[PDB]
């Protein structure tokens, strides 16, 4: 029903090809196994009309947020009123008896505060407060009543998602013999999700997402590639690292098509239905290897890779003819760029995009985006050809630095070349390239 | 809406007067404060289609059962599989660590099993499993992990009854600092109800209700009166006593109009909408005093008691004329029978029902029934008069041992008198009684 | 679902036996084939909050009124504003071209006015305005544009009752080739109902029902019997006759269990769920024959009639022993009273009710009521016996003029006999009757 | 609710800017005043699963199709079975008495057939069959029983759209005095719509939309402009003309933002939510005038036209400096293109797009599209400049024949120029244009 049209809004527009695909490879597959919108107390306390106005939205079309709050700003206040709010021994905290006592009530209180504001706003939330997390206890006196979420029981939650309501769950434990000690909210979600196997999975926070050296919303990450030129580059202060590592911890644990998405609530919709939103997307992508030699490849794969990505198959024996400069391939072999040397003087002088090869089940996960992204950082001057009826021309027009058309082919180049230095090399790629498919 | 007609089905029939009243004195007054249908594991395990088919019924018209299971037959099995099912030190039980462990899972399991079978059957149940009962712990090693329900938190439940679903709750505790030890299911409900303030309040059991010496369903009890000629009479074996005392414990704690009702599930409807059903009703009634002297009474009360129970007020100065044999009055002064001596030879010989005086807000709680019940055990020969348009004539026709009509009065007598011994005394009450209102 | 409890409210009370039966012999059987609540413009114009608040009620539980208005008081005004409101040639009316013109708009207007006030009040009405009644035309100039409803098309209506809404229909015709001339609203409903085959079928009117010589709501009629001592007795002024004949016209055309019911709207519920309400019920009953001779009967029928109405069968050869005074039987043989002569002096002197024999599928249609009704107009002194566990004792207690009990039998008599003249004959029936079953 | 996200799916993509606007200028404004999806018997008869599966869709989100069938293929068969299916005197038809008779039944039949298949598929249709169209009669014997829809009564329809169901209406008349003669389905809708004032308004047909000389789906028309080079050009066979004129008749009668849309049913969604679909869109646009002289304009308008279409206002006194070659403006002054001559040799040689000026409330009606469309048919060689953050760059990239970027400006040209003939003139527009805003 919905998808019938979600894709219709899609098809006729730009980033449609890559999103509609996201709606075909996951449509139908449990309800609970939709989002897993883990929130937080700073966002509860502050903006709730919009946190719940957006949670409505999904659950009122079909996609049933299986929320996971953890109210801590307010807790941290209600706790120090009587006192004992000091000491955080390790990277985490500490809690005493007359103290869980205070959390469990604040967890309770604001938990209910949510589940109601949904029901009030028109929703159907259903408080789920305990019994889900097997919180074995890490240390007894050196921390007291805190514990590492040893397992998870989904029954309590599969009930509410069999009914059809937003399982508003909690950062609380519960040993074996039933003692309820504290757990890390984050080491928590890693584990719920592992159990549930989501598709989407948003991390609401009161901020706006991840930042960069500049301080601009970095609308993506793609670990298997972008991981290093990040995890080693210093505008990655402190806990942002850990915010990153953790989300990384996760997705290795999901399929491939998953994807975190730390956004803001007002935006939540924008984020979960747009190749945009306003929250750092963040996949796991795949391992990508660069090949200088056309011999360290599974060419045959590339055949079912260019037979599946392109209409026909490659004009026979093309592979023994290919002179190969620089090759880019996804461990899985669902994406390839073949970089051939093409020009006149010598064997040079221009570097040329002979093939792009993404499989349907991919330009959706943004693979077509990660593989290409990884050569336009190696190779800075770039000239290619794409027909007129090609889908992914608009991707190109993005990258393209300039473009020129012909009823038979469209041509794109990539790089700055002085006024007189351009025309010369631009007329080239539109002269050697007419003769590549000859 | 419903009451508009519940009373229409009512008005035109027999026990209608006393039930429709029950629907006018309690209509509108919270939702949660409807039933409190505490069940049990022997009824869960065995007949659930009907336990849930009846729970539907209410919650699907408006009256929202706020259920309270406690699965124990099945627990008692799942527990001994691994073992440690022996020892019950005091009138209650005992439990260990690797042991709550087993209950909490069985409580959980069958709790969910319910909440689902409602949602499946069309209902709207909503699991509520923990955090409600403040189970302080009674003894540490001499029993281990069991506790007396020190308080109750209604939030967890007022949520689901603000939504509109059947709060399917649990016999489980939870100290202060959050350790979940065992509680008595029964000492439990006493305390939920105290907090909630129900109106109806049914105790489902797999049996059929309370029995008697014979072994016939004793469709009532009324403690303040029937208490003794019960609580001292020996067909009250063992725990039946305690089943009684406990229900007694309760209602002292409610308004007056409340009322337990131990029935079976298939019957549940019959019970909660009929002056019948098939479950021992059981109120608290009121304290009733017998008066031999027309001077140890608040006559004035009786005036607003006969001015409110009868159209007019008593023909002035009737009270200084009354010669009084035997008087029956409810501590509250909402019910009276005045027993006057009426006859010819001497001042005797027949004993005569001069007045019955029940206030609207009463023949509903069955006061008209308890006060009269308490003289037809003192006074065995009984002759009275009631007009033709009187409501409560059908009560009479019940009691009445015989009856005779006159366009101006209807006459009833009560007792066995030989063939020739009747006619003689029967013609009497229809000769001295025409001249009482003269 | 509903019946599960409608009968529970029932069973425990008085007129329950005869009404619950009405709910078992018709439960399940189309939706449209429920009511057919034909209203009228004087009730529309005046009280609509209650006409629609009651129509809601049914259609919002399941029973879907298939309403049939006919607004005429208001029409009769809106018509004379421009004029031409004079002439009513025959027992009916007359209409011209620039004139239907005015009705069709007023029919339209108030038709819509209803269908909306239902949707506003929470209902689900659905305007149905035309195309249903095949109104062939009776006379062309001598009346103009009026016609006799030659047939009916149910499609337009079975649509809205397949959806589940109150088919708010109309007193309008429509020749063959589609010209919309006027029809009698009443000759209309006769014909809809014929087509539809209702069960209940109420005639709302702004009055309160049918009256009597006195002027008291005559809560019944039963044509096949009560027809004559009515249709010939002069407090039957004018059109009341026709109101009667017409309803008579109908039911001959339905099953037996049907039944008109001219009530008021505020009462509608009371009427359609109580052996009461406030509207002249009115069946067709059956043809009843009086038999003076126990030989002009199908005794065998009476065997399956007393074998089905009573537990066992009649003590063998009882039929050749019966000395028969006066016999009452329903053409169908679903009801009998056997009147035997019983006494001492001679073969006289008391007349005695040996048998009452109603079949389940009957005391519901009120047959048990019509057959008995028809002897207590022939036979004025009446003495009978009924066990203690007998269902229909309360019917008796109604009729009974007096009653007396015995753990084995209950005894009833019928008639006024002076103080000393009673006891004598009353001791009798409780002396010859102990020895009838001997 | 919906729009909150319909626009979110939108914003991030291509044709979003022009469609989301369509959702902001019409959001909130009656319900009935949504679509007016007039269908037809060839589409009913043939594909109904999809005609109703799409009608669902709208009415089940909020947008309530107020359908308008007219079943004729099937009629034309069911009519000739008995016969009299011959003669069509004028451009229309003819019908007799024993003949409407046959339509009214077929209209009825298939009308109901629809209203049910909606209710079956999950919808909420509600048959409306008559009383809506005031069909005065055009000629009595020379055609018989056919008529021109003199007016319309919306009551019958505003009822069902106050309830919230799909008013499935009909091609039938009804004189004044209520005779139901035939009407043209098409001259019908013109008149319903006039009364209702739709926004969208689709014409389903079993075909696929309008065609061209080639025979390709002509995804648009825009009368005030494209009217002539159409209405005079001969691949406009016969009734296609009339199909056109008629839709033209209409929209002159609506606001501006309206728009027919002859599509197919399976596509209906695609059409009514995409700048695409598969049905000839078709507006009325506005009257556009070409100006050769910068003096026959309301420049001041252009100021609030370039002050509203562009951030600031025009650099003061720009208007007395403008040397103007060719000007394009919409009668209303919501759209302008200013064509200035720009080059080196002489005052020539290139023609240059100095300004595009569309008002928000416009590029939605596709004005930005019609005005520009009307110069790229006059002026064939075209060179312009647009910043990087400009919204409408993707429109451009469409038109653009080639493009080149600079962090400060983006440059586009339009036309074929030989290999050596391009570079020369292409370097130009990227040399004279850097100095236009200087």
Numbering used by the authors:
A (entry chain A), B (entry chain A), C (entry chain A), D (entry chain A): 10 to 447
Paper excerpt:
We have previously shown that xcNAGS/K has both NAGS and NAGK activity and that its NAGS activity, but not NAGK activity, is inhibited completely by 1 mM L-arginine. Crystals of xcNAGS/K diffracted anisotropically and had high solvent content (75%). MAD data collected from these crystals allowed the selenium sites to be identified, but did not have sufficient resolution for reliable model building, particularly of the NAT domain, and subsequent model refinement. However, the low resolution electron density suggested that there is only one subunit in the asymmetric unit, and that four subunits assemble to form a tetramer aligned with crystallographic symmetries, so that the xcNAGS/K tetramer has exact P222 point symmetry. The molecular replacement solution with the mmNAGS/K subunit structure as the search model confirmed these conclusions and assignment to space group P6222. Thus, xcNAGS/K and mmNAGS/K appear to exist primarily as tetramers in solution.
